[PDB]
Design an enzyme around this catalytic site. Structure first.
Site, mmCIF file in Angstrom:
data_model
loop_
_atom_site.group_PDB
_atom_site.id
_atom_site.type_symbol
_atom_site.label_atom_id
_atom_site.label_comp_id
_atom_site.label_asym_id
_atom_site.label_seq_id
_atom_site.Cartn_x
_atom_site.Cartn_y
_atom_site.Cartn_z
ATOM 1 N N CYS A 163 3.169 1.626 9.308
ATOM 2 C CA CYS A 163 3.560 0.364 8.511
ATOM 3 C C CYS A 163 5.278 0.476 8.174
ATOM 4 O O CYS A 163 5.618 1.624 7.715
ATOM 5 C CB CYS A 163 2.813 0.600 7.368
ATOM 6 S SG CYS A 163 1.073 -0.275 7.817
ATOM 7 N N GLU A 177 0.763 -8.170 0.511
ATOM 8 C CA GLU A 177 0.631 -6.604 0.613
ATOM 9 C C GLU A 177 2.381 -6.753 1.363
ATOM 10 O O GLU A 177 2.929 -5.722 1.992
ATOM 11 C CB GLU A 177 -0.062 -7.095 2.573
ATOM 12 C CG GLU A 177 -0.212 -5.653 2.890
ATOM 13 C CD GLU A 177 -0.529 -4.490 1.747
ATOM 14 O OE1 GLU A 177 -1.794 -4.771 0.728
ATOM 15 O OE2 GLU A 177 -0.600 -3.354 1.512
ATOM 16 N N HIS A 214 0.852 -1.026 0.017
ATOM 17 C CA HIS A 214 -0.094 -0.108 0.046
ATOM 18 C C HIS A 214 0.563 1.454 0.011
ATOM 19 O O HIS A 214 0.652 2.273 -0.665
ATOM 20 C CB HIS A 214 -0.753 0.070 0.872
ATOM 21 C CG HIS A 214 -0.456 -0.037 2.710
ATOM 22 N ND1 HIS A 214 -0.184 -1.338 3.359
ATOM 23 C CD2 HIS A 214 0.001 0.757 3.579
ATOM 24 C CE1 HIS A 214 0.473 -1.161 4.227
ATOM 25 N NE2 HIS A 214 0.263 0.404 4.214
ATOM 26 N N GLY A 257 0.751 5.100 10.037
ATOM 27 C CA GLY A 257 2.400 5.731 10.139
ATOM 28 C C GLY A 257 3.617 4.555 10.880
ATOM 29 O O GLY A 257 4.656 4.875 10.127
#
Ligand SMILES: *[C@@H](CC(=O)OCC)[C@H](C[C@@H]1CCNC1=O)NC(=O)[C@H](Cc1ccccc1)NC(=O)[C@H](CC(=O)OC(C)(C)C)NC(=O)OCc1ccccc1
Ligand SMILES: *[C@@H](CC(=O)OCC)[C@H](C[C@@H]1CCNC1=O)NC(=O)[C@H](Cc1ccccc1)NC(=O)[C@H](CC(=O)OC(C)(C)C)NC(=O)OCc1ccccc1
Lengths: 180, 180
Positions: free
Chosen positions: B147, B71, B40, B145
């Site tokens: 990740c 992911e 992401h 914040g």
């Protein structure tokens, strides 16, 4: 960047994990045999300090001139070893900063370092129903088991974490003049 | 105790702060010029890495055999400097542990080390509406914040933090075989 490194050296040399009948706390040794816990830890005549029972010879719950709760207990330990004297690293008054580290060290949260951001002089707070003074507020920590955590900037110890609600955390100011 | 020390050395030597058009992330360099971000983060042809623009030469969004989202994005940086090779520290499969550290390093959360407790193989998760695989679940972190944060035990890198809800946090397993 540096706040972290200052914080690790401090915790390495002066912090310990404490269990009272009221939970597990981070404890900071100050000088001689004197250490500090949140008032609500209510240490008894013996505490478990890093897995070992250690006698407490005296315990002073701090209050201001007018008897308002400061939410800190100073304890004198019945042990032969002295703490490294860190009175020189203590803030002389309530300190506001843009960035600080909260350092927590227990068996449940070992070696936890949290950048807590802006730290402001909140002052009076109704904390757990008790009127309390000299609170420092910051955003974003705030779970059971983190009390006693040490709030620091580079080269200064500002406070001891005592309470919180939602994303807000509160330290009792840790003032140089409390020691002696 | 040791997990913390392993974690500091890793972050010191192999992590960086990255800004994409989608936020700020912790980034871990793996070997050569290959680093890893959550999918992401969607890095473009240039990213800001520790305050400096750095070209990205290629970016691979990982998926399993059947095309299920993992992911993670592998990025190849257009820079002369190579990363210290840490492929040897990578888990070979999904790892479950009783205690792990999550390490996050950005301008907003610098030098943040969180003991996250039990890490379990959650497996499939509907994360931000996307079906995702090889998730590792733990209790207690969980804000924007964070990740890219690196999930580790002593001597192993387990995962990269990608999502969460409430007191639950989720890492994408960071597997040795992804690299090459
Ligand atoms: C650390 C000690 C501990 O864990 O004791 C229980 C085993 C803990 C840390 C806070 C818990 C939530 N966030 C924290 O950082 N401290 C306390 O629980 C502290 C104990 C205390 C302190 C002083 C006098 C008496 C008791 N109490 C609080 O922080 C209370 C928490 C509380 O009762 O609320 C919930 C448990 C969250 C429901 N906080 C409080 O009274 O805040 C009032 C308030 C309201 C709105 C804005 C600011 C403050
Ligand atoms: C890190 C990246 C980031 O900050 O992006 C926004 C600038 C962030 C970390 C989580 C936020 C809350 N807790 C965290 O740890 N990640 C995300 O926001 C992640 C982005 C994403 C990942 C994969 C595909 C698409 C998007 N999304 C989630 O974690 C979502 C969060 C969400 O939408 O919920 C709220 C914002 C909390 C309202 N989580 C999610 O989808 O969980 C579903 C779920 C429900 C119940 C149990 C487990 C999981």
């Amino acid at each position: 960047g540096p706040a972290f490194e200052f914080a690790v050296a401090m915790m390495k040399r002066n912090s310990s994990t404490v269990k009272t009948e009221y939970g597990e706390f981070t404890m900071l040794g100050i000088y001689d045999r004197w250490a500090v816990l949140p008032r609500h830890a209510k240490p008894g005549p013996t505490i478990l300090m890093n897995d070992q029972e250690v006698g407490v010879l005296d315990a002073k719950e701090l209050v201001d001139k007018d008897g308002a709760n400061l939410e800190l207990t100073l304890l004198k330990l019945n042990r032969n070893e002295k703490f490294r004297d860190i009175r020189g690293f203590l803030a002389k008054e309530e300190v506001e900063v843009n960035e600080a580290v909260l350092a927590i060290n227990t068996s449940k949260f070992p070696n936890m370092y949290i950048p807590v951001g802006q730290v402001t002089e909140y002052g009076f707070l109704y904390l757990g129903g008790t009127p309390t003074k000299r609170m420092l507020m910051y955003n974003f920590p705030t779970r059971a088991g983190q009390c006693g955590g040490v709030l620091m900037s580079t080269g200064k110890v500002l406070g001891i974490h005592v309470g919180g609600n939602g994303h807000q955390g509160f330290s009792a100011a840790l003032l140089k003049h409390y020691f002696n």
